[model samples]
Target: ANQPDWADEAANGAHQDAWKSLKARVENVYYMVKATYKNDPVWGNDFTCVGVMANDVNEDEKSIQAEFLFMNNADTNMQFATEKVTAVKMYGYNRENAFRYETEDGQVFTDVIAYSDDNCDVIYVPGTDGNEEGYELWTTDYDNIPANCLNKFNEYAVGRETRDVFTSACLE
Candidate 1:
């Protein structure tokens, strides 16, 4: 099978700067979620829950080590198999420059941040659909990660609006 186009750019170094920032932002959010509520009942044992809860935390408090719990083995099946499965979808924003931010406040908030074009990739796989065949949306090499793709991983991380950006549908 052919590699995705953005994968080529990612390998060519075009997205190095953006990738670096993206990784840092992802890690930052990961650690923040761990520190904030490492002992909370709902999120203590699982990073996915913590990540979800971090979405509700205040920005300043979001990065505490206690919040890191949210990212711990966040991709586990049990996590996504909850009543409503929500996955961590990352998008790359290219408004002012290449940078990433995450929020859990909700789409209503993240939509305000500068979003050039958002890429959505499923991070947590939910349970099977009624067909028992599993339901996957936007799965394709084209959806891997576009070079022009902005980093919205943080948006999925925190669930709220970042600095000065706006949000529209993932694809207009």
Candidate 2:
């Protein structure tokens, strides 16, 4: 269902309150794709957004159902697809200021590692098998992501690129 032994470690009690608060802030929100740090030169071509719904959220279990949407990277017109997913919350032992959304069903599908504060949130998608290149930054509003989040991604990445998804017809 998940990878990395440390990823499966139980949440430290000290982080529970903060984790819960982060959960509350992130759930039932729409996050638009802003930039990506990826080895693939064309990684930032698509217009994508992730919508996290609170309908089936189970706080006690720390699991939730979410959706992913994206327009075709190759198409000149708006060609999009939506995917349904189930992800479980994960935090590494003693790794403060970080958390993850690892997809279930014995497969990894764009799992996200994230850090959030009151002002903004940034995320990295390690991609399949935790090795494929995908570093996605997200924002709740159009052109609203902070500069610090972008800098944070570059601080941790080598391949860097961004997109103007806001101008895309798919986002319109």
Candidate 3:
């Protein structure tokens, strides 16, 4: 999607259902990348999308223009939570369906995400290109990442043979 028209149309507001769907897939990736390393299961939890809201603008701030919800573990009434939506001016979504937005502070924040077979989804980092190896997540490769990010990536990153799940998700 490098078309200027599509960007404007999306920036002005067009894909509510699409946006929610992407976020839904992204969160799964987020919890998954950390589980295999922590010896805990992030895939066990199944989150569901409730709804979405938006206000399109030519510019965007670190503001929440939408509200989204999910169940803790796919339970009808077991767990519930709210999520904030933030996407504006900068228009770009990677293959993982994660969007990267330009922050008012001159930083590009992203939803680094991807789908999975074993786990429903997987995530890399919130401010990455979503292409680098998981070895790059939370690593010194990016100052925005936590110092321990690299350690965690190194400790939990799956072998090259099994990285295809996350890698393929970001593939066009």
TM-score against truth, every candidate: 0.20, 0.55, 0.26
lDDT of 3 by residue, 69-139 (tens): 32335455523233344432334543113434343455544543232222122333322353233322211
Task: Please state the error at residue 103 of candidate 3 in Å.
Answer: 3.6
Superposed on all Cα atoms, model 3 deviates from the true structure by an RMSD in Å of: 14.8
- lDDT tens readout by residue for model 2, 131-165: 44545555555446667656655554445566544
Clashes of each: 48, 0, 4
Q: Using alpha carbons, what is the TM-score of model 3? A: 0.26
- lDDT per residue for candidate 1 within 1-172, as digits (tens), equals 2322232222433322323223333333321111112222233232332221122222332221123322234454323211111211223323212212333432111111122222322121111222111111111232244333223334332443322111121122
TM-score of 1: 0.20
lDDT of 1: 0.24
Q: Using lDDT, rank the candidates from best to worst.
A: 2, 3, 1
TM-score of 2: 0.55
Best by lDDT: 2
Badly placed stretches (over 4 Å) of model 1 are 10-12, 16-19, 22-27, 30-47, 50-67, 71-172
